[PDB]
Design a protein around this ligand. Structure first.
Ligand SMILES: CCCCCCCCCCCCCCCCCC(=O)OC[C@H](COP(=O)([O-])OCC(O)COP(=O)([O-])OC[C@@H](COC(=O)CCCCCCCCCCCCCCCCC)OC(=O)CCCCCCCCCCCCCCCCC)OC(=O)CCCCCCCCCCCCCCCCC
Ligand SMILES: CCCCCCCCCCCCCCCCCC(=O)OC[C@H](COP(=O)([O-])OCC(O)COP(=O)([O-])OC[C@@H](COC(=O)CCCCCCCCCCCCCCCCC)OC(=O)CCCCCCCCCCCCCCCCC)OC(=O)CCCCCCCCCCCCCCCCC
Ligand SMILES: CCCCCCCCCCCCCCCCCC(=O)OC[C@H](COP(=O)([O-])OCC(O)COP(=O)([O-])OC[C@@H](COC(=O)CCCCCCCCCCCCCCCCC)OC(=O)CCCCCCCCCCCCCCCCC)OC(=O)CCCCCCCCCCCCCCCCC
Ligand SMILES: CCCCCCCCCCCCCCCCCC(=O)OC[C@H](COP(=O)([O-])OCC(O)COP(=O)([O-])OC[C@@H](COC(=O)CCCCCCCCCCCCCCCCC)OC(=O)CCCCCCCCCCCCCCCCC)OC(=O)CCCCCCCCCCCCCCCCC
Ligand SMILES: CCCCCCCCCCCCCCCCCC(=O)OC[C@H](COP(=O)([O-])OCC(O)COP(=O)([O-])OC[C@@H](COC(=O)CCCCCCCCCCCCCCCCC)OC(=O)CCCCCCCCCCCCCCCCC)OC(=O)CCCCCCCCCCCCCCCCC
Ligand code: HEA
Ligand SMILES: CCCCCCCCCCCCCCCCCC(=O)OC[C@H](COP(=O)([O-])OCC[N+](C)(C)C)OC(=O)CCCCCCCCCCCCCCCCC
Ligand SMILES: [Cu+2]
Ligand SMILES: [Zn+2]
Lengths: 106, 101, 196, 139, 114, 133, 147, 89, 229, 81, 55
């Protein structure tokens, strides 16, 4: 419940750094399991969500400083496209016409 | 202030300035410095991590203030419209608890 | 209108003035206005998104992915606990988050993050001679006006708790330290002028 | 309303009359000043002040000097106790002053109201501050 | 927990209405048309203003809003406590009207003796 | 500059004023330090400690707190009265006549109400009054 | 001060490795900061017994006799004592609270005046006795008018 | 006194670490007023070697009424001319 | 007569003031203490929180109207101000106008928060994003501020002018469209996902089933001819 | 029980307790401006690289076609495969 | 752009995006969260149907 995975990646400066994948919740900190043990069970119950009164943060990224998507960006449309494909009927290649006349102007 | 010529020459020889100061104090004249007022900031350990100062974690007076608000509403409405007043003597031991307390 | 810190500033108020005048990241982060937090870059391994904490181990962070002008949000908000230590990543978009636990010190490491904070607003500091503007036209765009002015000839110097008590109880010690600080300020200004 | 209206009126009437001085007597060594002031019902009330603390301070606004009651020969002199943050008001009329201790008192309680309060000319501007010598004793 | 107590009170008032409406002839109130009307009004007011509202804006809103906005506490912790402790009086006033009448005595009480 | 001339006091501590300029004294003891100039300021520390603790929250004045006797009487009365309200309205509604007493008082212009009498003494006194305009 | 000319040289991709490296610049050492401060910071007293849940290793109290004495003025401050009326009434005041009076670093002023001061009467400097008659006249007049 | 953020954050000598040596923090040196950009649009486009800043200034903000009145004269006469045509029409 | 009726009148005013404290505390909490990044982005917050805040705004708008009407009732009973006495200018129908002006938004206040539970639970158990969250938010909002012009459908037969009667009927039926939008969005959130059946999910399905009949019956009540009977 | 605690009743050492010397301040300012200052943070992506691995190839041992053929075979059961 | 730099509070109220470009790498000192209710609850945006009914 603390980290769902970890990886070791070599950054552009040649140093190897550890990256941990935090457990997440669906927009609801109440459902989030705040724990400090490698345990799935929700053991810790906190009366004060913010013990030190420090506010949480929801960072907003500047579009100027953004970077083109590269984290499996080729999968964003996969779900919708694949759902449509499941019902789509594909013509067999042998029955599909081939070697048709070229366009006169292309 | 006056800086000794020999001391100034020593600084120039040992250090060559190649960057401009970013502090705006460089522009201040002697008159501005003289008119400046010194204020002291108390620096200590920091425990509160919010803009708002520490708030008390209990409200005893409010809880009892609400109890009276409940009592006034029930007693006042019953007396004005029902004309009924609770007979505290029926449960005499709760009245005695008040007396004993 | 500006509070006399040497007489009234203590603990929280004193810390707030330190953030205003010194803009130290540790103090500035604590008193950063909730409404606006400075926009940052998109988290990457080489350039991770930095989240600051004031001497706390973890902070609740939320992610919405790559933001676009049409929608302003990448994916639905997901909350996680960003903990001090190594870099951490969001499953949905891979954004990398780094937790910086700022410390109450003046060191080049802290100065490295000066650009990562909004300057602390001054208009709401001190005491205001106007309670609130009864104007429906500019209720959410204007602060309260001031009949008086704000002096700008004020120089702040940090002092320890026991020292601060000494300044209050002993006026003679207060005068002696004040005169010395003025002399150092005169020296500091003159040195800057020579450098220029 | 009756209880607090009476309390506020009487308490604030006392505060207004508190500043004015009825009697002022030095100690044997002229180290303390005993001041008699008006009580809430108009009787005498005793207080003690230190001559060193007592001081005649100039107005914060420098254009308000002409508006001081001290401009008049029969005006009022506002002496401030810098330790207790209290004000002592004395009539300027010599009839109310002892003429063999008055001179020392006004010469002892008027040390901070000096010439530089009015500014510096170009002859005394340089001398307005003490020059700081740096590096003369060592390089 | 307060909502559960009020909810049970609303359920009890609903049971009284249903028992009276079970079959014609007033098997429950036995001709007390006025008493039935008071019970019906108490049922409506208690359920609306003292069952649903406390559950949503009292329990859920207080419990969830700090989670979903990121606040140490509500802007007015005192008011939040005040709002909760004020509910009982309103609930009692609107819930017990069926029992309470200005003419408390029953039809067979010989008021001429007092 | 206009330095402080002399201090005609036998307390050697006060002679610190002689080492500074009058303008310096005015700046740090008269203009913005008037509430602090040449004062101990011990009360500032004492009041600061008083406000930054978990002391009794019942306040009457800036100088004094509420009398404990008044506080305890209010709290004891609040609990018992609150307990009576809950118990009577949830358990003792079967017999209203036995559980509640009927009383009132009307405007003195109108004739005295039949229920206007001192409770617990209706078996010992009868109360009446003369109408007033 | 041309912006484009400065930026095109100041920030370059090939210099990324050294552009974002934090280092302590070489500056002349200051005794007050680089010599004196570490000494005093390291020489702090240490206590074996400290509040485990909230305290630290350096939470060492300063003895009362070592607290700085109060020498601002000789006149006493009886407000610290608590007048008998407040005591009899049982009122609790912050000014005369034992915990708040026990300041950590500085002693509060003594309730009694310093032994150096002599309260023997000297000679009258200023005297305006008619103010009492004026005060009585105004105070009574406003009370009658207020009544 | 800076106009550009990149210049402002390039070489800073008044940082808290440096000022902490003297322990003097003048009010005139607040970060709030330390840097402020110009009101004219400035955007970056890729050059031959690196980013270059281009300013988009459209109109001035110091025109006076006398200039505006002269520019409005043709419009006023056209309104008079069109109205007269309608009356004669 | 004097008795329970008067206690209800004052208690309603008492409840209104209790509501005044409630939404004042919660609304200011969102506006002043919301975390950075969620100050104005209503979309990001969970649907229950969105629905709660919208209802609190509705309560603030309508609470004074109820208070004034209830206060006028108290004066008429005791002081005999004849506010609702037709003999000397009173308007008995004015009381119904003021109450129902708050009345209908109240029931909308009760229901709007309920939609939030299903909108959060279904995505959680389905491992899928909710369908058209933005449109659902605007669907509830339009219902919120369009319910202030349908208070008269509780007064069709009172004898009000046909011009007002038609306006209330026409707006009332139009309210059905945003409700249909939420229903389709709820249905679409259950398709093409990883379903994790749990007791909260089952209650959500029961909630959906009851709502469909509930709203449909209400739409029939909008039928003016049927509403008469 | 640990007992009462008040952190404000203990000395702090965040600031040096001795003022600087005039000459040292002048020398420090000279030295500070005679050498470059420490850099401030910058949030610009310099030669950004893919967070994941290389983009799957058109042809090879493992292609994007192999990835595309997985969506249709997705099951999370109660027993291992 | 002038409104954003000079009066950020009004610019956020009106719904304008931050007009400055941070390509140089240093974020601006007056950035703010976007309030897009005016531009979203419109006939031309996600609130199109709601405004059609309201209209
Ligand atoms: C030795 C003495 C002890 C001294 C030590 C200190 C004592 C502290 C005591 C503090 C008391 C606080 C107040 C208590 C209230 C109690 C209420 C109550 O239950 O009353 C009815 C209670 C029982 O009556 P019941 O018939 O069962 O029920 C009431 C009837 O239903 C209906 O009755 P009712 O119609 O007549 O209504 C009256 C009822 C109220 O009933 C109602 O509910 C009706 C209310 C109608 C209200 C109508 C208006 C509507 C309300 C709102 C209106 C305003 C509008 C607001 C809204 C806003 C609109 C704009 O309230 C009262 O009885 C009034 C209080 C009676 C006097 C008690 C005061 C005792 C002393 C207090 C001061 C002590 C300090 C002195 C200084 C010490 C040092 C020198 O009767 C009593 O008063 C008996 C108890 C009295 C206890 C006295 C103190 C303890 C000592 C007892 C003796 C033990 C031996 C000691 C030996 C000593 C040896 C040394
Ligand atoms: C509304 C009326 C209804 C009446 C109903 C009927 C009641 C009758 C019987 C009452 C007694 C019942 C038995 C219980 C007794 C208490 C024990 C108990 O179990 O109950 C606790 C019961 C409930 O407990 P609790 O409140 O929960 O506990 C916390 C308490 O704070 C406790 O906390 P604590 O432990 O910290 O407090 C202890 C303190 C009790 O708490 C206090 O400290 C309260 C304040 C006490 C002093 C009150 C009177 C003096 C105040 C000065 C101002 C006076 C006025 C101005 C002078 C001119 C006269 C107008 O105890 C004492 O020291 C009491 C001993 C007697 C003191 C007598 C002092 C007289 C001084 C006179 C000379 C100075 C004035 C100048 C004269 C003119 C010069 C030219 O508490 C009380 O009743 C507290 C007060 C009891 C003490 C009596 C206070 C009044 C005595 C006045 C005597 C006459 C003086 C004037 C004579 C004329 C010539 C001068
Ligand atoms: C719930 C159970 C009781 C408490 C917990 C268990 C016991 C813990 C302590 C035990 C060991 C140490 C004992 C030394 C005393 C320590 C506490 C203390 O100072 O005393 C409390 C307090 C005195 O402290 P204080 O000086 O007022 O506090 C001020 C300080 O600032 C401190 O202020 P604070 O901020 O801490 O709060 C002060 C507040 C302290 O906070 C409270 O405790 C608030 C009051 C309790 C909550 C009330 C909620 C409302 C609903 C109540 C319903 C109860 C059930 C029905 C009862 C009537 C019908 C049967 O004090 C009051 O205002 C007391 C008001 C008078 C009591 C009224 C309630 C009486 C009924 C309580 C339940 C009885 C259950 C057993 C009997 C069952 C019979 C069927 O009052 C008493 O000493 C009263 C004691 C006598 C009454 C209770 C026993 C008789 C109850 C009548 C029925 C049974 C008759 C047969 C009796 C057979 C022999 C037992
Ligand atoms: C003889 C009875 C005859 C039959 C009838 C009985 C009718 C009962 C009421 C029915 C409705 C509610 C029933 C709920 C029962 C389950 C409670 C529960 O979940 O366990 C506590 C549960 C603690 O267990 P946990 O959270 O699982 O684990 C924590 C560990 O316990 C570790 O916890 P810790 O480390 O913090 O240690 C403390 C722990 C250790 O102690 C225990 O666990 C002992 C067993 C539990 C005792 C619970 C009540 C104790 C007495 C309360 C008296 C008032 C406070 C005054 C001071 C009392 C000091 C003893 O005790 C507690 O946590 C208890 C706290 C009680 C707070 C009560 C005041 C809250 C405000 C009132 C809200 C509800 C209003 C309802 C009425 C509305 C009317 C319009 O605490 C809560 O969740 C708080 C619940 C508070 C509300 C319900 C209980 C108060 C009911 C008052 C009477 C209402 C009467 C109304 C009708 C009749 C009027 C005449
Ligand atoms: C007439 C009565 C006059 C009464 C005078 C009374 C005088 C005394 C005043 C004292 C009270 C002052 C304070 C008021 C506060 C009210 C409560 C509140 O929200 O406080 C929150 C306030 C702060 O809380 P918060 O959470 O920060 O609030 C967030 C904001 O409220 C933001 O809220 P939000 O997040 O929920 O934002 C919603 C807003 C956000 O959405 C928007 O941005 C709106 C849409 C804008 C874009 C539209 C584009 C459409 C397409 C273009 C046009 C197409 C047409 C063709 C032309 C173009 C062709 C190309 O969208 C809407 O729901 C607005 C409707 C939009 C539809 C537009 C339709 C246009 C067609 C034209 C005809 C219809 C116009 C209706 C009005 C329209 C709205 C102005 O809370 C507090 O401070 C605590 C509570 C304090 C309560 C105070 C006591 C209140 C007393 C009220 C008495 C009222 C009596 C009369 C009621 C019945 C009247 C009928
Ligand atoms: C939570 C409470 C609540 C809600 C949400 C509603 C919602 C609606 N109500 Fe109702 N109403 C009340 C509570 C509520 N009401 C109460 C308490 C009264 C009486 C008060 C009293 O007098 O005491 C009342 C009275 C009332 C009347 C007056 C009847 C009369 O007095 O004669 C009318 C008239 O049109 C009406 C209409 C509507 C409409 C059009 C909606 C719309 O919001 C509904 C929109 C939704 C739909 C229309 C659903 C669409 C349906 C589907 C998508 C499923 C279709 C499937 C099939 C057909 C199989 N209501
Ligand atoms: C027979 C009838 C009997 C009952 C009659 C009851 C009459 C009405 C009683 C008062 C209602 C509640 C008012 C509480 C005000 C004080 C709250 C408090 O303790 O302050 C703490 C708080 C401040 O403390 P805090 O803890 O909330 O926050 C301080 C700041 N922090 C948290 C950072 C430390 O102050 C307030 O909230 C004051 C009120 C602010 C404005 C809110 C609206 C008030 C008006 C509500 C409508 C009802 C009353 C007015 C209209 C009707 C009048 C009849
Ligand atoms: Cu309706
Ligand atoms: Zn993400």
């Amino acid at each position: 419940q603390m980290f769902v995975a970890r990886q070791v990646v070599t950054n552009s400066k040649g140093e190897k750094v550890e990256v941990l994948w935090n457990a997440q919740c669906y927009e609801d900190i109440a459902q989030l399991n705040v724990g400090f043990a490698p345990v799935l069970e929700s053991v810790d119950y906190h009366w004060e969500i913010f013990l030190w009164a420090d506010p949480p943060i929801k960072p907003n990224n500047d579009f100027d400083l953004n970077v083109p998507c590269t984290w499996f960006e080729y999968e964003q449309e996969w779900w919708m496209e694949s759902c449509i494909q499941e019902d789509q009927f594909n013509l067999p290649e042998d029955e599909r016409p081939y070697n048709t006349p070229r366009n006169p102007h292309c | 202030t006056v800086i000794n010529s020999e001391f100034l020459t020593y600084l120039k020889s040992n250090y060559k300035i190649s960057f401009s100061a970013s502090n705006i104090v460089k522009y201040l004249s002697d008159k501005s410095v003289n008119n400046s007022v010194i204020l002291y900031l108390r620096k200590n350990k920091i425990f509160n991590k919010s803009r708002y100062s520490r708030n008390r974690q209990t409200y005893r007076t409010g809880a009892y203030w609400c109890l009276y608000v409940n009592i006034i509403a029930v007693v006042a409405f019953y007396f004005w419209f029902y004309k009924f007043t609770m007979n505290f003597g029926y449960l005499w031991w709760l009245l005695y608890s008040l007396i004993l307390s | 209108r500006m509070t006399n810190t040497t007489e009234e500033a203590f603990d929280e108020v004193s810390h707030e003035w330190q953030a205003l005048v010194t803009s130290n990241p540790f103090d500035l982060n604590v008193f950063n206005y909730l409404e606006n937090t400075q926009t940052s870059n998109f988290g990457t391994v080489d350039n991770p998104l930095v989240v600051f904490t004031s001497e706390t181990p973890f902070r609740y962070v939320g992610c919405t992915g790559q933001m676009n002008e049409d929608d302003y949000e990448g994916h639905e908000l997901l909350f996680f606990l960003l903990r001090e230590g190594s870099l951490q990543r969001c499953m949905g978009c891979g954004q990398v988050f780094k937790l910086v636990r700022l410390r109450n010190e003046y060191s080049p490491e802290m100065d490295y993050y000066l650009s990562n904070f909004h300057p602390y607003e001054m208009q709401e500091m001190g005491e205001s001679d106007t309670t609130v503007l009864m104007s429906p036209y500019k209720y959410a765009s204007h602060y309260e006006y001031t009949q008086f002015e704000t002096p700008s000839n004020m120089v702040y110097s940090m002092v320890n708790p026991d020292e601060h008590d000494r300044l209050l109880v002993d006026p003679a010690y207060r005068m002696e330290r004040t005169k010395a600080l003025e002399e150092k300020y005169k020296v500091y200004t003159s040195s800057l002028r020579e450098v220029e | 309303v009756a209880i607090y209206a009476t309390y506020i009126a009487l308490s604030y009437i006392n505060n207004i009359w508190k500043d004015y001085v009825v009697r002022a007597q030095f100690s044997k060594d002229k180290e303390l000043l005993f001041v008699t002031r008006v009580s809430p019902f108009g009787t005498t009330e005793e207080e003690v002040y230190e001559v060193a603390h007592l001081e005649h301070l100039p107005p914060s606004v420098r254009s308000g000097v002409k508006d001081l009651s001290a401009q008049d020969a029969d005006g009022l002199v506002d002496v401030t106790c810098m330790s207790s943050q209290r004000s002592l008001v004395f009539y300027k009329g010599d009839q109310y002053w002892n003429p063999k201790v008055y001179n020392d008192f006004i010469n002892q309680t008027s040390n901070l109201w000096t010439r530089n309060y009015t500014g510096y000319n170009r002859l005394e501007v340089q001398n307005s501050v003490e020059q700081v010598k740096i590096g003369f004793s060592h390089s | 927990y307060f909502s559960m107590v009020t909810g049970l009170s609303g359920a009890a008032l609903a049971t009284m209405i249903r028992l009276e409406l079970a079959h014609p002839g007033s098997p429950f109130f036995k001709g007390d048309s006025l008493r039935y009307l008071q019970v019906v009004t108490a049922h409506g007011l208690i359920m609306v203003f003292f069952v649903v509202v406390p559950i949503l804006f009292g329990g859920f809103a207080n419990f969830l809003i700090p989670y979903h906005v990121g606040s140490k506490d509500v802007a007015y912790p005192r008011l939040n406590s005040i709002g909760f402790w004020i509910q009982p009086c309103g609930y009692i006033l609107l819930a017990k009207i069926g029992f309470l009448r200005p003419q408390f005595w029953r039809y067979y009480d010989k008021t001429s003796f007092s | 500059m206009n330095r402080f001339f002399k201090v005609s006091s036998k307390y050697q501590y006060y002679k610190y004023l002689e080492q500074y300029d009058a303008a310096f004294l005015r700046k740090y003891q008269s203009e913005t330090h008037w509430y602090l100039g040449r004062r101990g300021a011990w009360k500032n520390l004492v009041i600061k400690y008083a406000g930054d603790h978990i002391s009794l929250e019942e306040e009457h004045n800036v100088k004094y707190k509420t009398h404990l006797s008044f506080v305890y009487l209010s709290y004891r009365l609040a609990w018992v009265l609150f307990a009576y309200v809950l118990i009577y309205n949830h358990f003792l509604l079967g017999d209203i006549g036995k559980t509640f007493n009927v009383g009132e008082w009307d405007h003195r212009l109108k004739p005295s109400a039949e229920r206007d009498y001192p409770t617990r003494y209706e078996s010992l006194y009868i109360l009446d009054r003369t109408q007033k305009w | 001060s041309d912006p484009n000319d400065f930026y095109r040289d100041a920030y370059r991709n090939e210099n990324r490795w050294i552009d974002q490296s934090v280092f302590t610049p070489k500056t002349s050492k200051m005794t007050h900061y680089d010599v004196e401060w570490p000494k005093e910071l390291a020489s702090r007293p240490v206590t074996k017994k400290f509040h485990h849940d909230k305290g630290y290793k350096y939470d060492v109290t300063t003895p009362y006799d070592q607290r700085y004495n109060y020498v601002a003025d000789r006149l006493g401050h009886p407000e610290i004592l608590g007048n008998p009326f407040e005591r009899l009434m049982r009122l609790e005041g912050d000014i005369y609270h034992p915990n708040y009076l026990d300041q950590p670093f500085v002693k509060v002023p003594n309730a009694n005046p310093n032994a150096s001061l002599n309260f023997e009467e000297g000679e009258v400097l200023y005297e305006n006795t008619r103010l009492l008659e004026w005060a009585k006249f105004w105070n009574y007049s406003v009370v009658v008018g207020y009544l | 006194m800076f106009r550009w953020l990149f210049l402002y954050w390039y070489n800073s000598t008044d940082t808290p670490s440096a000022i902490a040596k003297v322990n003097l923090w003048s009010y005139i040196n607040l970060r709030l007023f330390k840097a402020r950009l110009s009101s004219s649009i400035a955007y970056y486009i890729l050059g031959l070697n690196n980013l270059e800043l281009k300013k988009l200034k459209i109109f001035y903000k110091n025109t006076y009424f006398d200039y505006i009145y002269l520019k409005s004269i043709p419009c006023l006469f056209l309104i008079i001319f069109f109205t007269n045509l309608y009356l004669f029409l | 007569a004097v008795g329970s009726q008067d206690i209800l009148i004052l208690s309603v005013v008492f409840a209104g003031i209790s509501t005044t404290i409630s939404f004042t505390n919660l609304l200011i909490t969102r506006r002043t203490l919301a975390m950075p990044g969620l100050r104005h982005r209503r979309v990001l917050m969970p649907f229950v929180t969105i629905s709660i805040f919208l209802t609190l705004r509705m309560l603030a708008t309508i609470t004074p109207v109820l208070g004034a009407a209830v206060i006028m009732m108290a004066f008429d009973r005791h002081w005999q101000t004849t506010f609702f006495e037709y003999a000397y200018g009173g308007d008995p129908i004015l009381s119904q106008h003021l109450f129902w002006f708050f009345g209908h938004p109240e029931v909308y206040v009760l229901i709007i928060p309920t939609f939030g539970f299903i909108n959060m639970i279904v995505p959680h158990n389905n491992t899928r994003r909710v369908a058209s969250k933005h449109h659902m938010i605007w669907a509830i909002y339009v219902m919120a501020y369009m319910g202030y012009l349908v208070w008269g459908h509780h007064m069709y037969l009172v004898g009000l002018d046909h011009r007002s009667r038609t306006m209330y009927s026409t707006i009332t039926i139009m309210i059905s469209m945003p409700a249909t939008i939420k229903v389709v969005n709820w249905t679409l959130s259950l398709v093409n996902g990883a379903l994790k059946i749990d007791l909260p999910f089952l209650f959500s399905m029961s909630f959906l089933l009851l709502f469909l009949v509930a709203g449909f019956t209400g739409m029939w009540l909008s039928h003016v001819s049927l509403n008469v009977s | 029980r640990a007992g009462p605690y008040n952190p404000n009743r203990y000395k702090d050492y965040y600031i040096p307790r001795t003022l600087p010397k005039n000459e040292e301040i002048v020398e420090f300012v000279q030295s500070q401006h005679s050498v470059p200052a420490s850099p401030i943070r910058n949030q610009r992506h310099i030669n950004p690289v893919r967070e994941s691995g290389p983009l799957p190839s058109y042809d090879g041992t493992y292609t994007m076609e192999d990835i595309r053929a997985v969506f249709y075979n997705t099951t999370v059961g109660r027993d291992y495969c | 752009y002038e409104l954003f730099v000079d009066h950020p509070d009004l610019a956020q109220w009106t719904g304008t995006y931050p007009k400055v470009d941070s390509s140089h790498g240093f974020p601006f000192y007056s950035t703010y969260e976007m309030y897009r209710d005016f531009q979203e609850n419109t006939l031309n945006s996600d609130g199109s149907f709601a405004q059609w009914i309201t209209l």
